[PDB]
A paper describes a structure:
Due to its indispensable role in viral replication, evolutionary conservation among coronavirus genera (alpha, beta, gamma, delta), and absence of mammalian homologs, Mpro stood out as a promising drug target for developing pan-coronaviral therapeutics. In this study, we present crystal structures of Mpro from the feline coronavirus strain FECV-UU23 in complex with four clinically relevant inhibitors: GC376, PF-00835231, nirmatrelvir, and ibuzatrelvir.
The binding pose of nirmatrelvir in the UU23 Mpro is highly similar to that in SARS-CoV-2 Mpro. Unlike GC376 and PF-00835231, nirmatrelvir has a large and more rigid bicyclic P2 moiety, which replaced the water-mediated hydrogen bond between the inhibitor and residue T47 present in the other two cocrystal structures. Despite the loss of the hydrogen bond donor atom at the P2/P3 amide linkage in nirmatrelvir, the 6,6-dimethyl-3-azabicyclo [3.1.0] hexane P2 moiety was able to make extensive vdW interactions in the S2 subsite and the side chain of L164 (S3 subsite) of UU23 Mpro. The comparison of UU23 (alpha) and SARS-CoV-2 (beta) Mpro variants revealed variations in the nirmatrelvir binding mode and conformation of the flexible loops at the active site. Additionally, the inhibitor was more solvent exposed as the interaction of M49 with the conserved catalytic residue H41 that locks the P2 group in the S2 subsite was missing in UU23. Substitutions, particularly of M49, N141, and Q189 that shape the active site in SARS-CoV-2 Mpro, resulted in variations in the loop conformations including the way active pocket contours around the γ-lactam moiety (P1) in SARS-CoV-2 versus UU23 Mpro. Additionally, the inhibitor’s rigid bicyclic P2 group may hinder subtle rearrangements to adapt to active site variations, which may cause a shift in the overall binding mode and reduced potency against UU23 Mpro. Substitution of key residues in UU23 Mpro altered the arrangement of loops that moderately increased the nirmatrelvir’s potency, elevating its IC50 ~7.9 nM–10.5 nM (against SARS-CoV-2 variants including omicron and delta) to 55.7 ± 4.7 nM.
Numbering used by the authors:
A (entry chain A): 1 to 298
B (entry chain B): 2 to 298
């Protein structure tokens, strides 16, 4: 029993984290094969104002890169841009390169963060992508280049690299192909995050998780049609639920229908009545159906 | 915001092995030429009270199956160290990290590598409660999951999961075989005493909320240490010994401990339908050091 936000083990990722220093900047890079991927603003000469990245690359001095891994230093063969990331060919192949691929995370989907502080892996925790392409990820100075990953079927999927924090605290990064999530720019100009639309699928999983744990104070016999909830959702900043069949395993092991839990969302979105669900005071959309079934049925 | 985080688990992952005895399957910690696991893996009937010493006398060492990826281990001998089975195996763990054994105390945080039938599945942070229990997420086949803490470049093994109480609390032992809270590894109903909340950790939890911009719960009102402790003794909260541990947190936020102590007494009554860091009640799971780490590095 129990439910905790969890991160898949980071052992397979830790050997790929390196310190990348250049000029006045020090951050993290991902050492896979004979490459070191890192945010391209590591070569920015002035991070206090807008950056001309075309000019910064045209004047790059490969000798100024200082990439380190324990007592090892990696020399840079060449440097190019791939989106908002620098691709640095290095003089050594990482002997601990795991079988891996690359992909992008979509809103409402969970993945793991290896928070690294200037080349030194510091912590590991799970996150969930928000509607606007952001995450809440406890990133501070020196943590750019920190890697987000997902483990599945023996393959390591790199899916996120950290870049910046918005004025409202939300955190922004890119996939390893250099595409910033949410369309944000790696420029030190003020940027806005639109309204946060909560994942309806994740909230249903959060309520199914409480029922399985034996917490049943919030459920009633009242139900709500999917079409009615979706109408309420697109008015209250909640995503639409495409099918009740997507929770067929959770409804079958608890005996509770999805339409029953939809009623609970609109009712609980008004307030928890001084009580809590799994210690939370409000609805939580950071747990996916996959992520609940894992914790609780193996 | 604020989230429970785990220290990187790479140094521990190579030590986890699947331990199977008959139809029983759980996890073990492979250190040196030894595999440590909960001793009830050899129990013939985990629904009844177990005569462990007699069960070990009737153990078939060859009935064990211990494996991890491309590693398969054979058992040479078996003994008990407290509630843990210590199996000497015919191969050393080539990646045994330098480490020590110690016990965590109430209010202290540490990391749990959740393992499912030999496969490290997840890692997450936990906090030791007053009655020697923790609130995690353990299910069948997760016994033997190891808890660890990295302090000062030193790896410490501090926990091995064993059972779940009727109220959902989770019980394990240190790596020396001593059960936390004195519970027994027997299928017998046992009760957890009244939980005493860590006042140090709640003050850190409120400091973190202030850092995140959530300051609706604050006021210029304050409460002396002597006054709070007199209140803590009769409301299931620990006493605060000094404000030095928060000197830094107070330096940045500019908020004093005595201000936050008043907030505890007031917020202990209820949050009035409002939230603090997504919580609807005071949280004592984050230590001063934990908050200083996440917020400032
Ligand atoms: C990489 N080490 C940091 C990580 C930051 C530091 C504070 N929290 C984080 O997540 N990334 C940066 O410092 C990037 C970097 C220049 C400025 N920057 C920012 O994150 C800034 N924010 C923005 O520019 C904004 F508001 F538009 F998002 C800062 C004010 C320092 C948070 C560049 C090249 C964008
Ligand atoms: C190890 N794989 C499991 C982990 C359990 C199962 C569900 N959640 C957990 O943390 N441990 C056990 O199965 C231990 C083990 C026998 C019974 N047991 C229990 O945890 C049971 N608890 C009790 O009997 C209680 F409450 F009295 F402590 C169970 C009912 C399955 C939760 C032994 C040897 C104690």
């Amino acid at each position: 029993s129990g439910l905790r936000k969890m991160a898949q083990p980071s052992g397979i990722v830790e050997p790929c984290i390196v310190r990348v220093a250049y000029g006045s900047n020090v951050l993290n890079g991902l050492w896979i094969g004979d490459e070191v991927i890192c945010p391209r603003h590591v070569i920015a000469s002035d991070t206090s104002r807008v950056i001309n990245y075309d000019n910064e690359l045209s004047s790059v001095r490969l000798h100024n890169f200082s990439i380190a891994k324990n007592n090892v230093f990696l020399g840079v063969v060449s440097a190019k841009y791939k989106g908002v990331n620098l691709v640095l060919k290095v003089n050594q192949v990482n002997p601990n390169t795991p079988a891996h691929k690359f992909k992008s995370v979509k809103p409402g989907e969970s993945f793991n963060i290896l928070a690294c502080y200037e080349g030194c892996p510091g912590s590991v925790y799970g996150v969930n992508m928000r509607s606007q392409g952001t995450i809440k990820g406890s990133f501070i100075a020196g943590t750019c280049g920190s890697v987000g990953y997902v483990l599945e079927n023996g393959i390591l999927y790199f899916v996120y690299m950290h870049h910046l924090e918005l004025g409202n605290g939300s955190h922004v990064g890119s996939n390893l192909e250099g595409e910033m999530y949410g369309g944000y720019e790696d420029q030190p100009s003020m940027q806005l995050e639109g309204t946060n639309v909560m994942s309806s699928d994740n909230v249903v999983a959060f309520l199914y998780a409480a029922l399985i744990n034996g917490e049943r104070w919030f459920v009633t016999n009242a139900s709500m049609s999917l079409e009615s909830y979706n109408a309420w959702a697109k008015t209250n900043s909640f995503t639409e639920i495409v099918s009740t069949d997507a929770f067929n395993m959770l409804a079958a092991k608890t005996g509770y229908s999805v339409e029953k839990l939809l009623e609970c969302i609109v009712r609980l979105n008004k307030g928890f009545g001084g009580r809590t669900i799994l210690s939370y005071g409000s609805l939580c959309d950071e747990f996916t159906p996959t992520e609940v079934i894992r914790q609780m049925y193996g």
